[PDB]
Symmetry: D4
Subunit: 153 residues, 8 copies
Amino acid sequence: RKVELDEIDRAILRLLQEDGRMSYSEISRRINVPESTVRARVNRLVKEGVIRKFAALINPFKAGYEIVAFIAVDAEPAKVKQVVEELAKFPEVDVLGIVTGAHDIFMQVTVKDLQELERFILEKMAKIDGIKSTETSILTSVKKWGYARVFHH
Amino acid sequence: RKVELDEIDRAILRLLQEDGRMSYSEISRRINVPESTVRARVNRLVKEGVIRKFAALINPFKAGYEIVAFIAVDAEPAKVKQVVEELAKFPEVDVLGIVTGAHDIFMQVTVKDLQELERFILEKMAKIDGIKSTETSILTSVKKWGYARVFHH
Amino acid sequence: RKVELDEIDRAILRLLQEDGRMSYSEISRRINVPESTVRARVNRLVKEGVIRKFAALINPFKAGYEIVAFIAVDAEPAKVKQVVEELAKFPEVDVLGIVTGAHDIFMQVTVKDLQELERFILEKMAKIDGIKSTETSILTSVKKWGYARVFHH
Amino acid sequence: RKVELDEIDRAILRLLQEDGRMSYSEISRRINVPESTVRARVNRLVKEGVIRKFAALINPFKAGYEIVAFIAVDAEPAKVKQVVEELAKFPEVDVLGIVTGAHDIFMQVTVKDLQELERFILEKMAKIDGIKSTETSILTSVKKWGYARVFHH
Amino acid sequence: RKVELDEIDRAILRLLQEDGRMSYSEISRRINVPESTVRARVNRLVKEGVIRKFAALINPFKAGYEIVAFIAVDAEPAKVKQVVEELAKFPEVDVLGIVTGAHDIFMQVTVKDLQELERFILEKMAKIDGIKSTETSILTSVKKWGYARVFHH
Amino acid sequence: RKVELDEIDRAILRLLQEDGRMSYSEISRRINVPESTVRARVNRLVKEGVIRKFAALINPFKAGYEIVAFIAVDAEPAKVKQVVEELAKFPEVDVLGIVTGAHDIFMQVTVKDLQELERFILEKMAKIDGIKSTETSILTSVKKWGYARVFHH
Amino acid sequence: RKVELDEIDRAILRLLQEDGRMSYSEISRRINVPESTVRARVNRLVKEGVIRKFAALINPFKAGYEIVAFIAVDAEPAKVKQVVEELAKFPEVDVLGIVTGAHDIFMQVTVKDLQELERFILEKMAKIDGIKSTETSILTSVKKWGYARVFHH
Amino acid sequence: RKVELDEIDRAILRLLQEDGRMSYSEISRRINVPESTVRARVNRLVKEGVIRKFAALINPFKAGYEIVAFIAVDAEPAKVKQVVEELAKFPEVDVLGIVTGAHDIFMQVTVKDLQELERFILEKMAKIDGIKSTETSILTSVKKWGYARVFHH
Ligand SMILES: CC[C@H](C)[C@H](N)C(=O)O
Ligand SMILES: CC[C@H](C)[C@H](N)C(=O)O
Ligand SMILES: CC[C@H](C)[C@H](N)C(=O)O
Ligand SMILES: CC[C@H](C)[C@H](N)C(=O)O
Ligand SMILES: CC[C@H](C)[C@H](N)C(=O)O
Ligand SMILES: CC[C@H](C)[C@H](N)C(=O)O
Ligand SMILES: CC[C@H](C)[C@H](N)C(=O)O
Ligand SMILES: CC[C@H](C)[C@H](N)C(=O)O
């Protein structure tokens, strides 16, 4: 699973997290590596899946999403994988995985308001076979943002 | 807090989540809007903070990070804000906020292995005044990735 | 959903929470606004649903109700709305809503004694399809009263 | 503590919960009891504290309050009474009491938005000596309203 | 439900808790009341059910019972009463009732050893329709004994 | 700790749990053992502590106690024994021990009403050094009674 | 169940826990007991089952197992024994028993990595009839090792 | 940390878990490898720490230990490592590590009876600085044994 990375790969990844739209000319000047080996190394990082893709990181509060929430899901053990497959199709779901501990499934969701949160949980998620329970924790403030998939509804 | 957005702004945001390195020429062709109004609208989205920035979205598993975890933190009520300020300085911390529910603080962290996770929790976080308890849930698989800040240690 | 309110509307709402039977003559003298615009503004607040209605606020302990309790209900996710619809028909139920967190449904109930509480939970609520569990917290003292619907059994 | 009530008292209480502004003339016609004994019985109910007072029952969502929440508070056992005394002074707090179970103190609060909820919990409640922990459950919908004290901030 | 008691009744109850085999002659001397009114008052206390009966209070540890445990039972809400009826038939069960809180049913049991505890829980209680879960808390020491029904197996 | 018991001892214990005031004449007739060996065996059971004593078993509901409750206590680990010593002095406390599990101390209490329960928990128990938390479960009905120490306040 | 042991048996057991491959010659010299009575006593300890067997105690981390975890299992009460029988067949399971408390079944498992842990829980354990829930706690460091059954997959 | 192992190493480890006292002559015959390379490979496994040591695996129930328990420990975050260091010195503690989840520290202990368990928890563990809480789960039956360090008190 791990892809071999060297010092130059990590330097490129650091710059492309500073500014995802950085030119390979600018990376080249800053790490004293040829534009050409920069370009080739980025194409390999993408080809290998180290870079899934590039994105605009959106502030959902500024975009008019009032509700960013973490939902902990309890699911029938034999249905956990199928429940994750169904959850992944909703554009409200930003982050989704299977976890150790007291809950089986962990997700982050972004919705416009509390009535949209309740519709999402009770009219969409609750119809998935195998969901026994949900526990929603609503962010009241965010110090460090992750990734929000927004306006895909 | 909400910034006024129209149909064209949302279209641009959708494309810039598809490919964060999309040229304004390419957005212009795809939404039949001038490169020039595309450029001006993106500069306003960034200026207003709707777009925090652009980034490479990294697969931490492929980058050699074996541990992606959610940590729920219980903190002395009067210290919650100060605890968040201290937590935000660690490059292991990808996502960090204050939440409603049974826990006060929610975060995602990315570390190389279980011994790095324990060092992070017991030799870094545990020295913060006001942390009473931590509960770590380790991702065993991720269906939908968020945002990982990686190689900043 | 929000109804537009100005300074005078809020002043009227403050007085009508001080004394729900306050004459529009008395409100008029106290906020130096005409009885006539007071009357018209109250009719609009009621028409718009800002004022649901006026009520006597009853002390259930003084009325002979010994048990004021909060019940947290866990329900099958797909049945939560239908469970709330059935719960709303009981006159024991004063306050009833859907909530984020560890429980799905939150309610306040008022009953005469512990045997009436057990009959309510086990012979009325428990027959509702979709209720998995109830957790009752009994008020031993009330510092600030809400609203009790009483003698409707 | 219980005040002696008869059939006519309960009939009056039922009507004054139907419409808190009902004339004693109207109650008199509906229960075939003299306006005069109606008036005297209501004055005794108020004098005895059975009727705390009359109020407008406000829909906080329509009044522009987006957040109606139940907060469960864990407090140092020796400080529970003093914590309740301090909590009672905030106009955000609608309902407040001491409870049996896993939490010591139960309250309902009404605030304008999530940032006001966090300020209330972390900059007001958290400064009270003896509060160890809070757990907030946010109403996403209300089927049966209680009592909200609003515009007193 | 409450049976009318006076000063002399309470005095008799105090003495009959000091020594359940106390003669009415001895009670008569100690409270300066006639043996005859003592006898008549005890017959009424028994007839009315204030005194369920008299018993030897046994130390189960000294009787060779190593395990005195409290079991909290979670039951399907619609089956709680029937579950209690079935539980009451086992002679291992000393105390049994329905409770407010996180559990539905509370009991104390006395068994000879850990293998008898597991047989009781898994081969007797677990076959009752409606039991979803049990949580056993084993007494490691008893400061104040209640009542143990022993040698009835 | 275990005291040696034979078939006749167990037979006597069974009868003295049927009726704690049973004459040794009556036990003698029912188990075909001499009154004299019956008497000697009971004196040894008491001397050895197998029989702590005899008591009237009281129905607290009929005696006017409305509240029979189980309280789970969380205590500082180093103070658990001292907390039990202090708890044992209250006549409200019927049963008291140290337990395995999520709570340290388990007790049953009997008080007249909810205001007496709150005074007991907050003005008596809460002043004990080392009590961190209490969780009270109130009996709404009792199928099998234990032992209540009553009228000792 | 207990097998009679004397001073010499316990001395032999202490030495055979120091070094499971200790010669009976070496035990004989160290406890000043004949090789022959040492041999006979060890054969009886094995025959009686006091010594289940001898084993190499393996460090799973050094053997390339990255994941040593404790799994708490919640099971339908009537199926707990059958669930344990099925769990015992997996070579990943090192320690397995039935427990008092909030969980029914407790086990330790050893697997190569997080993806093997998830496959074990979701594709093997989850197919067992009667498993309602699992809670995995992953060891981040071990101060005192138990017993790991390794390379049996 | 991982030590390089081949097919022959794993075969030797499998046999030395079957019988920890197996002669290298017997391993040699069973895997068709020279006694001499068997001996050298075992000396390297021990030298590298893959084999911590060899031991008799004892059945504590047969050895007269009635109580095998798992204890979950909650500790002040800054003291977790020091608490583990102190816990490791007790011979009652068989297995001890730091864990992810709701508890910080996990251990297995073996003691003779319930009074020894309470003395261990309250007079030994509870005196360790930083222990906030313990939760003991007692094994009622063991299907698969781990490792018990016994008679070292
Ligand atoms: C793979 C983990 C599963 C889903 C569960 N949360 C557990 O801890 O065992
Ligand atoms: C702002 C929320 C705080 C931190 C706490 N989690 C609560 O629910 O009340
Ligand atoms: C709408 C909320 C639902 C009912 C659940 N309590 C949760 O937190 O996810
Ligand atoms: C009066 C009740 C106290 C505050 C606590 N909640 C208990 O159940 O014991
Ligand atoms: C009657 C009480 C029921 C059984 C449940 N324990 C509750 O608290 O609501
Ligand atoms: C003796 C038991 C202590 C008090 C705690 N309840 C535990 O389970 O470990
Ligand atoms: C035998 C114990 C069962 C499985 C459950 N854990 C209880 O505590 O009652
Ligand atoms: C290293 C883990 C710590 C001790 C805690 N149990 C947590 O999950 O975060």
